[PDB]
Structure formats: structure tokens, C-alpha cells
Design a protein around this ligand. Structure first.
Ligand SMILES: CCCCCCCCCCCCO[C@@H]1O[C@H](CO)[C@@H](O[C@H]2O[C@H](CO)[C@@H](O)[C@H](O)[C@H]2O)[C@H](O)[C@H]1O
Ligand SMILES: CCCCCCCCCCCCO[C@@H]1O[C@H](CO)[C@@H](O[C@H]2O[C@H](CO)[C@@H](O)[C@H](O)[C@H]2O)[C@H](O)[C@H]1O
Ligand SMILES: CCCCCCCCCCCCO[C@@H]1O[C@H](CO)[C@@H](O[C@H]2O[C@H](CO)[C@@H](O)[C@H](O)[C@H]2O)[C@H](O)[C@H]1O
Ligand SMILES: CCCCCCCCCCCCO[C@@H]1O[C@H](CO)[C@@H](O[C@H]2O[C@H](CO)[C@@H](O)[C@H](O)[C@H]2O)[C@H](O)[C@H]1O
Ligand SMILES: CCCCCCCCCCCCO[C@@H]1O[C@H](CO)[C@@H](O[C@H]2O[C@H](CO)[C@@H](O)[C@H](O)[C@H]2O)[C@H](O)[C@H]1O
Ligand SMILES: CCCCCCCCCCCCO[C@@H]1O[C@H](CO)[C@@H](O[C@H]2O[C@H](CO)[C@@H](O)[C@H](O)[C@H]2O)[C@H](O)[C@H]1O
Ligand SMILES: Cc1cc(C)c2cc(C(=O)NC3CCCCCC3)[nH]c2c1
Length: 725
């Protein structure tokens, strides 16, 4: 199979390069418009009670458009908002923007449209010092994605209102900024990472062409994968976060796959094989390794599909498409490229760009020896410290997206915070009690008061007017609502947002009046229901993830102790990185240096980070411990096999780690705190696996079990033998 392709890829090397490059470039052109076909939904559970509550509320009362855009207007030259000349000028400008963009803007409302109003709420849309007043600009659209697109059409003209002295906040200015970080992080991966990957690869290989080929494969992999995701978007919604994942996870593995087979090819040429034989032998050995690595990653990714969140489903499609294409590219276009180049892959050295030994082996061999001489002296301190690194995970907190996902100095975030300071109480995050009478008869005022009294028995809800009778007010109704009298909604915000899980259960435990059912919704309910469904499915997801990888490791090791030992090592790294991440992003250690706000984490990201870290650690352990098994099966001491595996894989694993560190390190500078969390989790797990696990914990522990590492019942080794994966 790999034998046949190794000969075939040589024979049709020109056809292979031409077809594969055209497909990837054609996919890249198709994938340019992906950013215009992604969605922001997917963080919630579509089957939850809170989602049903939101659908009923919107259907009966109408979609609330008053939070789409809020604009703070400050008169120039220290004038007050009561300046009649200033009022007329800004009013005419706003009317012109609405008239020019009626397809996008419903209109604008606020104190400026009725300065002589007596309504206390409308009169509160201006500050006491008369220096600031704000307006609401509802937008057209039937869903949040369409509404955001409408906002981005009119934003440039809106920002010019009042001589530019207008501050835009609310849902869509922030949603535009949050989704805008995707483009900023992506250019880093393609303008800052790839050049740094090139200098890292040049330090590994020493020649220009050998260093350039893995970078080119990564670029082709990104181009094709974005095109595949664009195709996927035609059939199912694709979350916008799936796009940066392609450029982070897909790019890193694509370059690492390229590094592995280019390294093997140069070693085959150096051993004396001609180009034809070298290509075949590289596919037979390194091509099998990358293909098996791909199935490990795919096996580590598909368990996320158990979760209902569309966000997680979109990520796995991106991951699977990225790794399958990269594996295919590494053994089709890369192998064909080396077949054409031959030894000329090393032709160009430092001088080209310039114009435009025994000690090392012994030391690393000695380090393994020192570790094995006193293994408990190494394993015991490492085991203790890694367990202590799990302790901060006990302080795990979970929430949802806000303006705090942006750095504290972000302009749009600061406009939002200025609005909440100048105009307190206008922003709310209420829990809703969606009352429905199954009889179809109208809900009475007494029944609404019965429900309010029940909700007033739950502590922790805000009382701004100090009167409980003014709490749990009815949701405002819009003209787009059906106003079905059999459905009525009352709502109230929480005093402390972290109490949402407890308070929602209390609300859901209240007995409603006789013939009515109650659905509890609101944004805090949407998050808590999504949190609950994720951790409900997590035990099954973790079970499938562990067993699928362990059997794959058993197929790769031919042992029963080795897959179990490596699963324990994977669990230790997974726990340690999560504690460190909680220590950094919840507790805030490192927040000032990296300019992010400590806050609760996003729950679907822990599921993603579990799958990614488990896959990465399994991938590195499989490659290393194999070379030990391969040395043991041919006849060697257990101590020598550990030394041979470490020496023979040291250059490749270290180089792969350096590559991924550059790629992930580029994304730790993202303005989105969620991306920082994912990129750092990758960096920590990589540093632990490449240094603490590979060089200290693996060689030490494996010496403790001695020759029992290779133990495996023969009726199980026969199944491994009959397949030979
Ligand atoms: C993160 C913060 C973003 C969320 C905050 C956004 C919510 C704040 C927007 C307030 C919108 C509702 O506030 C106000 O309600 C009143 C009461 O019906 C509406 O009703 C008003 O209409 C117009 C004013 O334009 C006049 O005829 C009159 O003063 C009144 O009837 C106003 O048009 C609306 O401005
Ligand atoms: C690998 C990622 C998972 C790491 C999990 C982090 C757990 C941190 C525990 C903090 C201590 C709080 O202790 C709590 O214990 C209960 C069971 O008693 C578990 O969780 C329980 O409480 C939560 C809190 O509302 C409820 O949704 C529910 O009743 C149940 O899930 C969690 O463990 C933790 O919520
Ligand atoms: C591959 C191995 C991985 C296997 C991992 C298995 C982990 C299983 C853990 C189940 C218990 C965690 O359960 C989860 O606990 C957290 C606390 O952190 C609760 O979290 C709750 O309290 C926290 C802290 O007050 C709030 O910030 C949060 O909004 C609220 O939901 C979750 O509601 C509950 O669902
Ligand atoms: C990636 C996309 C994520 C972008 C999200 C970033 C967060 C942006 C900040 C939120 C700003 C809007 O803040 C918004 O305030 C309004 C008005 O108080 C709340 O609106 C709430 O009260 C109003 C008026 O009583 C009800 O008609 C409505 O049904 C209810 O939801 C919204 O629930 C909240 O979302
Ligand atoms: C036969 C006796 C007389 C017939 C009754 C006619 C009404 C008499 C009661 C008027 C005062 C009731 O007192 C006040 O009622 C209003 C309107 O219902 C309630 O108002 C509350 O419920 C109503 C719906 O019922 C919501 O639309 C509103 O947003 C919410 O605040 C107040 O919470 C209550 O304090
Ligand atoms: C800088 C931080 C970046 C983020 C984290 C990256 C983690 C990478 C750390 C790698 C640690 C050093 O890891 C060590 O690398 C050396 C040199 O490559 C390998 O050594 C390998 O190459 C050397 C020559 O260079 C040979 O003599 C040796 O026989 C061979 O094994 C070791 O087998 C490995 O144990
Ligand atoms: C889930 C996941 C995520 C990432 C970023 C990576 C990176 C690798 C990797 O670098 N693997 C290499 C070493 C294993 C042997 C074959 C050569 C490739 N695996 C990953 C898995």
C-alpha cells in the first residue's frame, strides 16, 4: 500500500504536484469568502429550556432591537445637549444615514428625537451635566448574522455623525469587533508566524529548499482547508471560530508532517539511496507515521460531536479537514516535490539568502542515563508538582461572551464601559419567566401576580426602584410580536451573575399557577443550560476519547501496560495545563503582562481544549515510545531501547515542538481572550510533553516497570500482528 504509492508518487510526480496544487489553490480562492458565510451561534444547546424560552418570547413579544446599537453623542466646544442648533444638525445627519440605508436601519430613537419629553426613561438618555446623550439605532434583519452584516454596512457613515464625536456600543459594534479579531490573528499566522517558522526550519535543516517545503505545505493545507470549510458552510452553519483553528491547529500539524518526511528523505539520501528509492522508503516509514498520526488526531476529535453546541461541531469539522488534507499533502505534493528535487533539496545554503557532535549525542545519552540511575529521584518530585498544578482547577468558573473578551484598552470595549457608567441601568441581563397557558385562554393579571409573588420568594434579584412591586416587570412588546394572550413574560436581572446556576434552579422549582407552564430563559439561562449539557456529556466524551486512543496505542505498541501508562501520562498533562490555565485566566496571574481581563472561562472551550491536548500528547507519546518498541522487538535491553528511542527521535520531536511553539505563540497575542486560552493551553502542554514527559517522566517510569512494559497477551498481540498498524 505505502510501497505502491511510494513508487506511484515518483512515477506521476509532475501530475501529482499539478493536480494537488491546483485543488488547494482553487480551494483557497473558494475559501476567501468563508468569513462572509460563518455564524456567531453555536455556544448554546438548541434543545434546552432557555432556548425554547427565547423562541417563545421573541415570537410573542417581538425581537428586541433596542440594544442593536447605542451611540453616545457629545456636543463640541463644551456645548450642552440642549443646544437647539446642535440638536438640529445631528438630527439631520442621523436622518440622512437612515434614509440612505433603509434596507439596513429601522430607525433611530432617543431623547434627541423628543427633547421636551416628560418620560423618565427617555429623559434618562441624557446625562445630568447635559454633556452627553445617547440614542438607540435598531437594525433590520431576521437573525443575528444578518443584523451584524447590516451594521457593518452602515458603520462607516454612522461613525462620521457629529464630526466623528460619536461612540458606538451595544451588541453589533462589539460583535463586529469580536469577530474582527479573526482577521487580525490570521494575518499574524501568515505574515509573522510563517516567516519565523522559516527561520526555525532553516536552523533545523541548514538549507533553504528543505526549510521552505514544510512552510509551503502548511500554506497549501490552510488554503484547501478553508475551502473545505466553505463547502461545509453550504450544508450546515459554521461558527466563525472554526476559521482561526484552521490556521493554528491545521498549520502547525501540516508543517510538522512536512518536517517529518523531509527529514526522513534527507536521511535516506544521506544513507546512499537514490531519489527513487528514497521517496519510496520515506513514504513507507514517515508516510505511515503521519497517516497514523492523522487517525490519532481524528480519533481524538470526533468525540466532541457528542456535544450539542454547534460551536464544537464546527471546530471538529475544521480539525478533521485540516489534518486529513495535511496528511494527504505531505505524501502527495511533498513527496513528488522531493522526487523532482532529489539531493538538490540541500542545494542552497546560507550564502543564497545572505546575498539575494559526539559531545551532543553523549550528553543527551548521558541525561537519559542519569535519569535511569536515580529514577525515583526524578519521577517522585515531578509526580507531586504536576498533581499540585491541578489544584487551581478547583476554582474553575464558567460564563459567556462579553466586551471583557477584548483587551481592557480596546476602544470598542471602552465605549461600552463608558456607556454603562454614563447611563446606568439601561443595560440588563434578565432571567425570564415565560408563562404559557396550555388552554389557549388569556393569562390573567392575577396569575401574573401569582408568578411574581413566587419569584419574589427567591433572593438575589436586582431591585432598582427599591419596590418589589416594580420587580419582575413584563417584557416590553414590539409590533413584530404576535401578542398571543396565552403567553406572558416577566423578567428580572440578578444581583450577582455567578449565582445564575443556583437561582435558575430555584426559579424552575417554583410552582406556577394552576394551568400555566413556565420556561426560564434569558442570557444567563442560555449559558447555564449549555454548561450543564456539556458537563453532562463530558463523562461519555472522555470515555470514548480514552478508549479509542488506548486501543490505537495498543495497535501501535503491542503492549497492555504501555497504552495504560501513556493514558495516565496524558491525564497528568491534561490536568496540569488546565490548572495552570485556570490559574492564569480565572485567577488572573499574568493578566497584566498579557493585557487580558481575568474572568470565567467559556465552557465549550474546555471540551475543545481537552480533545486537543489529549490528541497532542497521544501523538507525541506514540512516536517516541514506538521507536523504543521497535528497538526492543529486534533484540535489545530495556535500558538500551529507552536510550535508542530518545536519541533516534530527539531531533524530530524537538523541531516539531519548536515549530508548534512559534505557531501557537503567534496566537497568544490575539485580542480575543478565548484564543489566548487555547493558544496557551497548547504551549503549556507542548512544553510539558516535550521536556518534562519525554526526557524525564517517560524514561524514568519505564525503567521502574522494567521488561513488563512490553507485556501483552499473545492472543491480543496476534490481533495486532494480523493487522500491523
Ligand atoms: C450595552 C448597552 C446596550 C443596551 C442598552 C440599550 C437599551 C436602551 C435603549 C432604550 C430604548 C427604549 O427607550 C425609549 O423607550 C421609550 C418608551 O417606549 C420609546 O418611546 C419614545 O419614543 C419617542 C422618543 O424617540 C417619543 O415619542 C417619546 O419620548 C416616547 O414615546 C423611545 O423611543 C425609546 O428611546
Ligand atoms: C476537567 C475539567 C473539569 C474540572 C471540573 C472542575 C470542578 C471544580 C469543583 C469546584 C467545587 C464545586 O463543587 C461542585 O461539586 C459538584 C458535585 O459535588 C460538581 O458540580 C455540581 O454542582 C454544580 C454547581 O452548580 C451543579 O451544576 C450540579 O449540581 C453539579 O454539576 C462540581 O464538582 C462542582 O460544581
Ligand atoms: C479526559 C478526562 C477528562 C474527564 C473530565 C471529567 C470532569 C467531570 C467534572 C464534572 C463536574 C464539573 O461540574 C461542573 O462544575 C462547575 C464548577 O466548576 C459548575 O459550575 C458552576 O459553578 C461555577 C463556579 O461557581 C460558575 O462559575 C458556573 O457558571 C456554574 O455553572 C458546573 O455547573 C458543573 O457542571
Ligand atoms: C460574538 C457575539 C457576542 C457579542 C456579545 C457581546 C456582548 C455585548 C454586550 C451586550 C449588550 C446588549 O445588552 C442587552 O441589553 C438589553 C437591554 O437591557 C437586554 O435586553 C433585555 O431587556 C429588554 C428590555 O427590558 C427586553 O426587551 C429583552 O428581551 C431582554 O433581553 C439584552 O438581553 C442585552 O443583551
Ligand atoms: C375589582 C377590583 C378592581 C379591578 C382591578 C383593576 C386593577 C386594580 C389593581 C391596580 C393596581 C395593581 O397594582 C399593580 O398592577 C400592575 C398591573 O397589573 C402590576 O404590574 C405588573 O404586572 C403587569 C401585568 O399584570 C405587567 O404588565 C407590569 O409590567 C408589571 O409591573 C403591578 O405589579 C401591581 O403593583
Ligand atoms: C524554547 C521553548 C520552546 C517551547 C517548548 C519547546 C520544547 C522543546 C524542548 C526540547 C528540549 C531539548 O530536547 C532535546 O533536544 C535534543 C537536540 O535537539 C535531542 O537530541 C537529538 O539531537 C542531538 C543533536 O542535536 C543528537 O546528538 C541526539 O542524539 C538526538 O537525540 C534530545 O534527544 C532532546 O531531548
Ligand atoms: C490534537 C493535536 C493538535 C496539534 C496542534 C498537534 C500537533 C501534532 C504534531 O506535531 N504531531 C507530530 C508528532 C507525532 C508523530 C507524527 C509527526 C507529527 N499533533 C497534534 C495533535
Amino acid at each position: 500500500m505505502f510501497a505502491w504509492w511510494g513508487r506511484t508518487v515518483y512515477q506521476f510526480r509532475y501530475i501529482v504536484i499539478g493536480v494537488m496544487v491546483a485543488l488547494c489553490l482553487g480551494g483557497g480562492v473558494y475559501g476567501i469568502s468563508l468569513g462572509n458565510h460563518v455564524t456567531q451561534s453555536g455556544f448554546y444547546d438548541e434543545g434546552s429550556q432557555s432556548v425554547a424560552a427565547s423562541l417563545i418570547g421573541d415570537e410573542v413579544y417581538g425581537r428586541d432591537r433596542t440594544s442593536h446599537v447605542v451611540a453616545i453623542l457629545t456636543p463640541p466646544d463644551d456645548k450642552k445637549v440642549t443646544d437647539k442648533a446642535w440638536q438640529k444638525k445631528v438630527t439631520e445627519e442621523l436622518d440622512q444615514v437612515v434614509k440612505d440605508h433603509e434596507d439596513q436601519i429601522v430607525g433611530w430613537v432617543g431623547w434627541l428625537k423628543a427633547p421636551d419629553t416628560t418620560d423618565p426613561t427617555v429623559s434618562a438618555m441624557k446625562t445630568q451635566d447635559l454633556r452627553h446623550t445617547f440614542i438607540s439605532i435598531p437594525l433590520q434583519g431576521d437573525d443575528d448574522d444578518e443584523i451584524l452584516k447590516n451594521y457593518q454596512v452602515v458603520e462607516p457613515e454612522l461613525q462620521q455623525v457629529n464630526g466623528g464625536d460619536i461612540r458606538l456600543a451595544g451588541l453589533n459594534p462589539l460583535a463586529s469587533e469580536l469577530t474582527g479579531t479573526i482577521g487580525e490573528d490570521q494575518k499574524r499566522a501568515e505574515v509573522a508566524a510563517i516567516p519565523l517558522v522559516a527561520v526555525v526550519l532553516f536552523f533545523v535543516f541548514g538549507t533553504v529548499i528543505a526549510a521552505a517545503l514544510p512552510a509551503i505545505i502548511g500554506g497549501l493545507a490552510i488554503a484547501g482547508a478553508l475551502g473545505i470549510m466553505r463547502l461545509v458552510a453550504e450544508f450546515t452553519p459554521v461558527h466563525f471560530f472554526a476559521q482561526p483553528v484552521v490556521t493554528l491547529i491545521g498549520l502547525g500539524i501540516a508543517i510538522d508532517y512536512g518536517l517529518f518526511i523531509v527529514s526522513r528523505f534527507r536521511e535516506e539520501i544521506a544513507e546512499g539511496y537514490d531519489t527513487e528509492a528514497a521517496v519510496r522508503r520515506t513514504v513507507m516509514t514517515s508516510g505511515r507515521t503521519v497517516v497514523f498520526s492523522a487517525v490519532i488526531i481524528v480519533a481524538s476529535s470526533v468525540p466532541l460531536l457528542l456535544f450539542p453546541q454547534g460551536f464544537l461541531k464546527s471546530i471538529t469539522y475544521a480539525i478533521i479537514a485540516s489534518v486529513m488534507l495535511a496528511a494527504i499533502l505531505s505524501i502527495t505534493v511533498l513527496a513528488a516535490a522531493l522526487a523532482i528535487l532529489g539531493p538538490r533539496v540541500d542545494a542552497l545554503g546560507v550564502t543564497t539568502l545572505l546575498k539575494i557532535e559526539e559531545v551532543e549525542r553523549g550528553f543527551w545519552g548521558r541525561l537519559v542515563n542519569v535519569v535511569m540511575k536515580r529514577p525515583i529521584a526524578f519521577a517522585a518530585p515531578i509526580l507531586v508538582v504536576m498533581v499540585l498544578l491541578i489544584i487551581p482547577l478547583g476554582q474553575l468558573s464558567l460564563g459567556g461572551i462579553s466586551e471583557k473578551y477584548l483587551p481592557p484598552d480596546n476602544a470598542v470595549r471602552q465605549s461600552q464601559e463608558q456607556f454603562d457608567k454614563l447611563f446606568p441601568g439601561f443595560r440588563t441581563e434578565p432571567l425570564t419567566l415565560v408563562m404559557k397557558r396550555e388552554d389557549g385562554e388569556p393569562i390573567t393579571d392575577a396569575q401574573i401576580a401569582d408568578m411574581r409573588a413566587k419569584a419574589l420568594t427567591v433572593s438575589g434579584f436586582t431591585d432598582p426602584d427599591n419596590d418589589p412591586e416594580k420587580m419582575w416587570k413584563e417584557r416590553p412588546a414590539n409590533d413584530s410580536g404576535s401578542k398571543d394572550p396565552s403567553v406572558r413574560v416577566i423578567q428580572n436581572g440578578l444581583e450577582n451573575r455567578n449565582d445564575a446556576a443556583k437561582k435558575i434552579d430555584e426559579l424552575r422549582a417554583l410552582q406556577p399557577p394552576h394551568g400555566i407552564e413556565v420556561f426560564v430563559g434569558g442570557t444567563p439561562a442560555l449559558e447555564q443550560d449549555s454548561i450543564h449539557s456539556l458537563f453532562d456529556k463530558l463523562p461519555l466524551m472522555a470515555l470514548i476519547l480514552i478508549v479509542t486512543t488506548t486501543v490505537l496505542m495498543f495497535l501501535a505498541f503491542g503492549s497492555v501496560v504501555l497504552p495504560i501508562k501513556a493514558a495516565l501520562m496524558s491525564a497528568l498533562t491534561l490536568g496540569s495545563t488546565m490548572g495552570i490555565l485556570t490559574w492564569m485566566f480565572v485567577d488572573g496571574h499574568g493578566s497584566g503582562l498579557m493585557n487580558y481581563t481575568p474572568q470565567p472561562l467559556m465552557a465549550p472551550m474546555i471540551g475543545l481544549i481537552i480533545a486537543v491536548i489529549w490528541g497532542l500528547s497521544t501523538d507525541y507519546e506514540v512516536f517516541l515510545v514506538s521507536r523504543m518498541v521497535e528497538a526492543r522487538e529486534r533484540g535489545m535491553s530495556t535500558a538500551e531501547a529507552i536510550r535508542i528511542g530518545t536519541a533516534t527521535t530527539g531531533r524530530l520531536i524537538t523541531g516539531a515542538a519548536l515549530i508548534l511553539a512559534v505557531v501557537a505563540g503567534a496566537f497568544v497575542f490575539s485580542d480575543l481572550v478565548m484564543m489566548k486560552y487555547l493558544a496557551f493551553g497548547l504551549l503549556i502542554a507542548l512544553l510539558l510533553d516535550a521536556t518534562i514527559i519525554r526526557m524525564f517522566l517517560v524514561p524514568a517510569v519505564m525503567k521502574l516497570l522494567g521488561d513488563d512494559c512490553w507485556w501483552a497477551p499473545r492472543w491480543m498481540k496476534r490481533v495486532q500482528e494480523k493487522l500491523g498498524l
